[PDB]
Enzyme design. Structure first.
Site, PDB file in Angstrom:
ATOM      1  N   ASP A  81       0.887  -1.170   0.000  1.00  0.00           N
ATOM      2  CA  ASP A  81       0.000   0.000   0.000  1.00  0.00           C
ATOM      3  C   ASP A  81       0.910   1.200   0.000  1.00  0.00           C
ATOM      4  O   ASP A  81       1.820   1.282   0.811  1.00  0.00           O
ATOM      5  CB  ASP A  81      -0.935   0.034   1.232  1.00  0.00           C
ATOM      6  CG  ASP A  81      -2.191   0.929   1.032  1.00  0.00           C
ATOM      7  OD1 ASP A  81      -2.138   1.986   0.369  1.00  0.00           O
ATOM      8  OD2 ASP A  81      -3.270   0.595   1.548  1.00  0.00           O
ATOM      9  N   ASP A  92      -3.344   6.784  -3.552  1.00  0.00           N
ATOM     10  CA  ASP A  92      -3.380   5.764  -2.554  1.00  0.00           C
ATOM     11  C   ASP A  92      -3.569   4.545  -3.321  1.00  0.00           C
ATOM     12  O   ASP A  92      -4.624   4.306  -3.861  1.00  0.00           O
ATOM     13  CB  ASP A  92      -4.580   6.016  -1.623  1.00  0.00           C
ATOM     14  CG  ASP A  92      -4.565   5.160  -0.341  1.00  0.00           C
ATOM     15  OD1 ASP A  92      -3.751   4.203  -0.208  1.00  0.00           O
ATOM     16  OD2 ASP A  92      -5.411   5.465   0.537  1.00  0.00           O
ATOM     17  N   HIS A 152     -12.551   4.326   1.317  1.00  0.00           N
ATOM     18  CA  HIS A 152     -12.765   5.532   2.069  1.00  0.00           C
ATOM     19  C   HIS A 152     -12.597   6.725   1.163  1.00  0.00           C
ATOM     20  O   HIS A 152     -11.764   6.737   0.276  1.00  0.00           O
ATOM     21  CB  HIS A 152     -11.755   5.624   3.230  1.00  0.00           C
ATOM     22  CG  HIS A 152     -10.340   5.302   2.830  1.00  0.00           C
ATOM     23  ND1 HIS A 152      -9.432   6.269   2.439  1.00  0.00           N
ATOM     24  CD2 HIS A 152      -9.679   4.117   2.748  1.00  0.00           C
ATOM     25  CE1 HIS A 152      -8.264   5.701   2.171  1.00  0.00           C
ATOM     26  NE2 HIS A 152      -8.391   4.394   2.333  1.00  0.00           N
ATOM     27  N   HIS A 160      -8.535   9.501   5.403  1.00  0.00           N
ATOM     28  CA  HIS A 160      -9.923   8.952   5.614  1.00  0.00           C
ATOM     29  C   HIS A 160     -10.825  10.091   6.094  1.00  0.00           C
ATOM     30  O   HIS A 160     -10.473  10.816   7.000  1.00  0.00           O
ATOM     31  CB  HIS A 160     -10.011   7.842   6.689  1.00  0.00           C
ATOM     32  CG  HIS A 160      -9.023   6.700   6.547  1.00  0.00           C
ATOM     33  ND1 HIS A 160      -7.666   6.827   6.817  1.00  0.00           N
ATOM     34  CD2 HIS A 160      -9.217   5.380   6.266  1.00  0.00           C
ATOM     35  CE1 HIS A 160      -7.064   5.655   6.653  1.00  0.00           C
ATOM     36  NE2 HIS A 160      -7.985   4.757   6.330  1.00  0.00           N
ATOM     37  N   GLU A 186     -10.774   0.033  -1.844  1.00  0.00           N
ATOM     38  CA  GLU A 186      -9.991  -1.143  -1.489  1.00  0.00           C
ATOM     39  C   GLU A 186     -10.950  -2.234  -1.196  1.00  0.00           C
ATOM     40  O   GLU A 186     -11.809  -2.109  -0.323  1.00  0.00           O
ATOM     41  CB  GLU A 186      -8.995  -0.960  -0.341  1.00  0.00           C
ATOM     42  CG  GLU A 186      -9.095   0.301   0.489  1.00  0.00           C
ATOM     43  CD  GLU A 186      -7.946   0.425   1.492  1.00  0.00           C
ATOM     44  OE1 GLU A 186      -6.866  -0.200   1.270  1.00  0.00           O
ATOM     45  OE2 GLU A 186      -8.121   1.154   2.507  1.00  0.00           O
ATOM     46  N   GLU A 279      -6.053  -1.640  -4.401  1.00  0.00           N
ATOM     47  CA  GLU A 279      -6.744  -0.347  -4.270  1.00  0.00           C
ATOM     48  C   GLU A 279      -6.280   0.641  -5.302  1.00  0.00           C
ATOM     49  O   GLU A 279      -5.068   0.778  -5.562  1.00  0.00           O
ATOM     50  CB  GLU A 279      -6.644   0.253  -2.824  1.00  0.00           C
ATOM     51  CG  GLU A 279      -5.587   1.328  -2.488  1.00  0.00           C
ATOM     52  CD  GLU A 279      -5.645   1.831  -1.035  1.00  0.00           C
ATOM     53  OE1 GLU A 279      -4.700   1.519  -0.280  1.00  0.00           O
ATOM     54  OE2 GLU A 279      -6.612   2.551  -0.642  1.00  0.00           O
TER      55      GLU A 279
HETATM   56 CO   LIG Z   1      -4.438   2.562   1.366  1.00  0.00          CO
HETATM   57 CO   LIG Z   2      -6.199   2.997   2.415  1.00  0.00          CO
END
Ligand SMILES: [Co+2]
Ligand SMILES: [Co+2]
Length: 294
Positions: A81, A92, A152, A160, A186, A279
């Protein structure tokens, strides 16, 4: 601002792809992260947060520390990630990798989840549509979506930010996708239960609040914390040398207790079932979406 956001994307993109390439059996996690975090700064990015190299039953919120002699063994399912920002606009992204091996249908499930999720997203869609789309992809391959660990919303200097993008159909996830919304999607999939647990150690942290601290030492850390890192997560390891031995761990703990910072512990599958994650960050448009991280 789009382009800043898009640039974050581009870099997250390459950095990821390079991380894939490095990820062979025997490769030191510590080293890997360091490479990855560098390549970011190289391209004119700064991290949104430390790279999350999570192995197998471990699902998220692992990022190494100095003396972290974790090396990848062949057949390990590695979640990568990667966070990048550009004046606080965030990309992200995350990819699962099975080291020295080919894509597994666990991996396939999560991956197709993401795609399916991207597909159906447009301005004016209800969140659950993306839930269903992901639930569908994973269950249908005999697998279990992780239900308390999802995408998110994203904002400026806010990893977030209100709204989660669940990996299950629920009937009162009705947030209607505005055009301009930024979002990480994700999906996680698993062989275990579909439920994760907090377990130590606690390796990522975040500035949360300006509160007063009794102890001289901690107070000065909170300054260096706000200064070098602000509202974004930061690894334990980024602070390491600055102090004696457990003097840092403690100083961090003193600050947690005070309410100044939060400690992201490590998420693990309730039943040590192996875990997959893909993600992308996206941005909404009338009738489609921009995928900042492809
Ligand atoms: Co992430
Ligand atoms: Co994340």
């Amino acid at each position: 601002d789009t382009e800043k956001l898009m640039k974050a994307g581009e870099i997250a993109k390459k950095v990821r792809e390079k991380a894939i390439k490095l990820a062979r059996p025997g490769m030191l996690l510590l080293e890997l992260a360091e490479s990855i975090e560098k390549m970011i700064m190289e391209l004119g990015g700064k991290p949104a947060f430390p790279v999350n190299l999570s192995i197998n039953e471990i699902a998220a919120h692992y990022t190494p520390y100095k003396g972290d002699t974790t090396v990848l063994k062949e057949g390990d399912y590695l979640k990568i990630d990667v966070g990048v920002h550009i004046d606080g606009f965030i990309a992200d992204t995350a990819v699962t990798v099975r080291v020295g091996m080919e894509e597994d249908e666990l991996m396939e499930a999560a991956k197709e989840a993401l795609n399916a999720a991207i597909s159906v997203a447009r301005a004016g869609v209800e969140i659950k549509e993306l839930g269903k789309a992901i639930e569908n992809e994973i269950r249908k391959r005999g697998f279990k979506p992780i239900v308390n660990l999802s995408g998110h919303k994203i904002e400026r200097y806010k990893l977030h930010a209100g709204i989660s993008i669940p990996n299950i159909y629920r009937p009162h996830d009705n947030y209607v996708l505005k055009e301009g919304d930024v979002f990480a999607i994700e999906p996680f999939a698993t062989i275990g239960a579909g439920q994760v647990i907090e377990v130590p150690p606690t390796l990522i942290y975040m500035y949360v609040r300006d509160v007063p601290v009794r102890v001289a030492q901690a107070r000065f850390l909170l300054a260096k914390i706000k200064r070098e890192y602000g509202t974004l997560p930061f690894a334990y390891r980024w602070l390491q040398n600055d102090m004696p031995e457990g003097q840092l761990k403690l100083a961090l703990k003193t600050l947690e207790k005070a309410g100044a910072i939060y400690g992201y512990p490590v998420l693990k599958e309730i039943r040590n079932g192996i875990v997959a994650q893909f993600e992308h960050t996206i941005i909404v448009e009338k009738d489609s979406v921009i995928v900042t991280t492809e």
